[PDB]
Design a binder for this molecule. Structure first.
Ligand SMILES: Nc1ncnc2c1ncn2[C@@H]1O[C@H](COP(=O)(O)OP(=O)(O)O)[C@@H](O)[C@H]1O
Lengths: 165, 168, 369
C-alpha cells in the first residue's frame, strides 16, 4: 500500500519479489526476480536506473548463492547495480555502485559513489567503503548517518505521494 | 532458432546469433551500420549496449561487422561498440569496449574497465578493473586453465539460462 | 616486556614496524590521501610553515599507527630513524608531534648509517645510502661516524625521475584513442616509479663507456618493450632511453662527481690508519641500490676510478669488498634500528624521554654546547 512503485519501473517475478512498507521504487528501475527472490526492507529508497538482479538460480548441487536482500532504511542511490548483496539495515549505497557475489554489507555502512564491492566481501559495521578495489576508508559516525537516513526517508515520502502513476 | 531472445530485449538491423545464445532483458542490439555476428553459447546480460561503427570508406576504412566469439560471457551493463572478440572472453559488468579492438581468446575484462580503441588485447590476460591496459594478473587466465574455466562458466551460464527459461 | 616502535621516515617511502621482528610489518608510501584534493601531498618536506608541517606529521602518524602497529605507542618506546643531515627544523617538528600531541614515553633521533652498520655486525665500515632526494656517504670507524669525511650529490631517485621525464618528452610514441608525440606535458610520479622498477636495465662498465662515447661522437641499443597506461593510451618506450637515464648517475665529466667518485672523496678525507678498514667494508644501502645489476656497475666504476692517476697517489692498491646485509638494500637502515631498540632496554636510557623534553626544550642535535 505505502510502497510507491513507479510506472516506468519494472518488477519481474512478483511472487519472488518483495517490497516492505513505506518503500520507494524510482523510475526506470529493474527488480528482476525471475530466477530468485528479492527482499526489500521497510522505508528503503531504490533510486532511478537501479538494476536489482537476482544473484543465482539457487539450483546448484553444492554452494548455491544467496538470491537477494535489503535491510530497513536502505538508501540505494541512482544507477546502482545491486546484485547478490545482503544489505544490512541503514546501508547507504553510493551512486553508480556495484555489489558482488555473496557480499555481506553490515549495519550502518556507507558505500562510496562509483564503488565496486567484490564477491564474498564482508564489509564491517560503521565503516566507509572506499577505493577502486574494495577497502576500509575510515570509521563513520552513528549520529550523522542516522540523521541523513531520516531526512532521505522524509523526502522520498513526499515524492511517493504525488506525480507517479 | 535455438537462442533465448527475451521479449523486453531490442534488436535492430542484421544480426545473426549462434546456437544456445542468451539475450537478457532490456539488452540493446543495434546493428544498423553493419551485420552483427554473435558466437555460439554467447550470453548477453541485461542493460547491454551492442553498437557498431560506420564502415566502408575507400581510404583507411573505419570498421567492419563486430564478430563476437563463442562462449563469450558479456556481463550486465556492458558496452561493446565495434570490438572484435575471441572465444571464451569474460567481459565484466559496466565495461566499455573501444571503437576498434582485437580481444584474444581466454580473456577476462575487469569491472568498470575502458577497453582500448585501436588496441589488440593479447591471448590469455585478465584486465584489472580500474586503470586501462594493466599487464599484471595473466597466469591464472592462461590458455589451458582459462579454457577449462570458460567451459565451466559456459556450463553455469547455460544451466542458469535453462533454469530461467524453465521459470519463464 | 615491551617491544618498541621503529620508524624510518623519507620523501618516497617509509619503513615502519616493531622492534625485534626480522623486517618491518608494512611500508606505506610517504604521501597522504586527503578528501577534496586533486593530487596526494608528500608528508616529508623542508622549508615550509611550522604549523602546517605539524598538522601534516599528525595526519601521517595517525594513519600509520592504526594500520601498521595496531596499538597506542603510549605504552612503549619509539625509534625515529632520521637520516643524518635531515634538517633540525624538521627534527624539532617531529619532536613536538611525538611529545605534545601523542605524548609518547620516549623517542630517539639516531642516524641511519650507524644502524645500517649494526645489521652487518662490524664496528668499522664505509657506508653509502642512495635514497630518493640525495645519495649520502658517511664512513664509520669503530662505532663513531667520521663526520667531516662525507659527500652527498643531488643524484638519487628524484634525479632519475627528472631524467626519465626529460627523455620520454623528447622521444615520445603514444597510441591513439599512431604518432602524436608530446600530447601530455607531464606524467604522474607513481607511474614513473613503476617504470623504473620494471623497465630500467642497468648497464655494465664497458657498455656505459660505449654509451658515453656515442653521446659525444649507438652500440648495444636493445632491448626495448612498451609500457601499458590507463585511459587507452599505451606508449612505446624505447630501450636506449632507459639505459641513458641510468647512465647519468655514473656520469663523471665536467662535474668531477658521481655515485662512485663520492666514495673515493669520502675515503680521501679520512685519515691514514682508518683508510684500509673502510675500503675493505664498503656497505651499499638505500632505494636506488635495489635496481637490477647495480652493485657490479658501482664496484667496476669504483675500481676504474682507482686506476686513474689522480687517485693512485693516495689510494693505490685496495681490496674493495662489498659485504652485503641480511635484509634487502632499501630496508637495512630500518633493521638496524629494530636491532638497537628490541634487544637493549639499557640503550633506551641514553635516548631522550618525555620528562627531559618538557623542562629542557629539545632533543640535542650534533651542534655546539
Ligand atoms: N624494489 C625496488 N626496486 C627498484 N627501485 C626501488 C625499489 N623500491 C624503491 N625503489 C626506488 O628507490 C627510491 C626510494 O628511496 P628511499 O630509500 O625511500 O629514500 P628515502 O628513505 O631517503 O626516502 C624510489 O625513488 C624508488 O624508485
Amino acid at each position: 500500500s505505502g510502497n510507491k512503485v513507479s510506472r516506468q519501473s519494472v518488477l519481474c517475478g512478483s511472487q519472488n519479489i518483495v517490497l516492505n512498507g513505506k518503500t520507494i521504487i524510482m523510475n526506470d528501475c529493474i527488480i528482476r526476480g525471475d530466477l530468485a527472490n528479492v527482499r526489500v526492507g521497510r522505508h528503503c529508497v531504490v533510486k532511478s536506473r537501479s538494476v536489482i538482479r537476482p544473484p543465482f538460480k539457487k539450483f546448484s548441487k553444492g554452494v548455491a548463492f544467496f538470491p537477494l536482500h535489503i535491510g530497513d532504511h536502505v538508501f540505494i542511490e541512482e544507477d546502482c547495480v545491486v546484485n547478490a548483496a545482503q544489505i544490512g539495515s541503514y546501508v547507504h549505497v553510493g551512486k553508480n555502485c556495484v555489489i558482488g557475489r555473496r557480499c555481506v554489507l553490515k549495519d550502518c555502512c556507507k558505500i562510496l559513489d562509483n564503488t565496486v564491492l567484490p564477491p564474498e566481501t564482508v564489509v564491517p559495521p560503521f565503516t566507509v567503503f572506499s577505493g577502486c578495489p574494495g577497502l576500509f576508508s575510515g570509521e563513520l559516525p552513528e549520529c550523522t548517518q542516522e540523521l541523513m537516513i531520516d531526512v532521505t526517508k522524509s523526502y522520498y515520502q513526499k515524492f511517493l505521494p504525488l506525480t507517479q502513476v | 532458432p535455438g537462442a533465448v531472445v527475451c521479449v523486453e530485449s531490442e534488436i535492430r538491423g542484421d544480426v545473426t546469433i549462434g546456437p544456445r545464445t542468451v539475450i537478457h532483458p532490456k539488452a540493446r542490439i543495434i546493428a544498423e551500420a553493419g551485420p552483427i555476428v554473435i558466437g555460439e553459447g554467447n550470453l548477453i546480460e541485461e542493460q547491454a549496449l551492442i553498437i557498431n561503427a560506420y564502415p566502408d570508406n575507400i581510404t583507411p576504412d573505419t570498421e567492419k561487422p563486430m564478430i563476437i566469439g563463442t562462449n563469450n560471457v558479456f556481463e550486465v551493463g556492458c558496452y561493446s561498440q565495434a570490438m572484435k572478440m575471441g572465444d571464451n572472453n569474460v567481459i565484466e559488468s559496466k565495461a566499455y569496449v573501444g571503437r576498434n579492438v582485437i580481444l584474444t581468446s581466454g580473456c577476462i575484462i575487469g569491472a568498470c574497465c575502458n577497453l582500448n580503441t585501436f588496441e589488440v588485447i593479447p591471448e590469455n590476460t585478465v584486465i584489472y578493473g580500474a586503470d586501462c591496459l594493466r599487464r599484471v594478473q595473466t597466469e591464472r587466465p592462461q590458455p589451458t586453465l582459462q579454457l577449462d574455466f570458460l567451459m565451466k562458466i559456459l556450463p553455469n551460464y547455460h544451466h542458469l539460462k535453462k533454469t530461467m527459461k524453465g521459470s519463464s | 616486556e615491551k617491544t618498541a616502535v621503529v620508524i624510518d621516515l623519507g620523501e618516497a617511502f617509509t619503513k615502519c614496524g616493531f622492534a625485534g621482528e626480522t623486517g618491518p610489518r608494512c611500508i606505506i608510501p610517504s604521501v597522504i590521501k586527503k578528501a577534496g584534493m586533486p593530487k596526494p601531498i608528500k608528508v616529508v618536506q623542508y622549508n615550509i610553515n611550522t604549523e602546517e608541517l605539524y598538522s601534516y606529521l599528525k595526519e601521517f602518524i595517525h594513519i600509520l599507527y592504526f594500520r601498521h602497529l595496531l596499538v597506542n605507542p603510549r605504552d612503549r618506546r619509539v625509534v625515529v630513524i632520521e637520516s643524518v643531515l635531515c634538517p633540525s627544523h624538521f627534527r624539532e617538528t617531529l619532536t613536538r608531534v611525538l611529545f605534545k600531541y601523542f605524548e609518547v614515553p620516549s623517542v630517539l633521533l639516531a642516524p641511519s648509517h650507524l644502524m645500517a652498520l649494526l645489521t652487518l655486525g662490524i664496528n668499522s665500515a664505509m657506508v653509502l645510502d642512495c635514497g630518493y632526494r640525495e645519495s649520502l656517504v658517511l664512513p664509520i670507524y669503530e662505532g663513531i661516524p667520521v663526520l667531516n669525511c662525507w659527500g652527498a650529490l643531488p643524484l638519487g631517485g628524484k634525479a632519475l625521475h627528472k631524467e626519465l621525464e626529460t627523455q620520454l618528452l623528447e622521444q615520445c610514441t603514444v597510441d591513439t584513442g599512431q604518432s602524436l608525440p608530446s600530447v601530455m606535458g607531464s606524467i604522474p610520479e607513481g607511474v614513473l616509479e613503476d617504470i623504473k622498477v620494471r623497465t630500467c636495465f642497468v648497464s655494465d662498465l664497458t657498455r656505459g663507456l660505449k654509451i658515453q662515447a656515442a653521446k659525444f661522437n649507438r652500440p648495444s641499443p636493445p632491448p626495448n618493450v612498451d609500457y601499458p597506461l590507463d585511459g587507452e593510451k599505451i606508449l612505446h618506450v624505447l630501450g636506449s632511453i632507459r639505459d641513458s637515464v641510468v647512465e647519468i648517475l655514473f656520469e663523471q665529466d665536467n662535474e668531477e662527481k658521481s655515485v662512485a667518485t663520492l666514495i673515493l672523496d669520502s675515503l680521501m678525507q679520512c685519515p691514514i690508519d682508518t683508510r684500509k678498514q673502510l675500503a675493505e667494508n664498503l656497505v651499499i644501502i638505500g632505494g636506488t641500490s635495489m635496481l637490477p645489476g647495480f652493485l657490479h656497475r658501482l664496484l667496476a666504476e669504483i675500481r676504474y676510478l682507482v686506476e686513474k692517476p689522480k687517485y693512485k697517489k693516495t689510494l693505490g692498491t685496495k681490496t674493495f669488498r662489498i659485504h652485503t646485509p641480511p635484509a634487502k638494500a632499501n630496508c637495512v637502515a630500518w633493521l638496524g634500528g629494530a636491532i638497537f631498540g628490541a634487544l637493549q632496554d639499557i640503550l633506551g636510557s641514553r635516548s631522550v624521554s618525555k620528562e627531559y623534553y618538557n623542562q629542557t626544550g629539545r632533543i640535542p642535535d650534533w651542534c655546539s654546547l
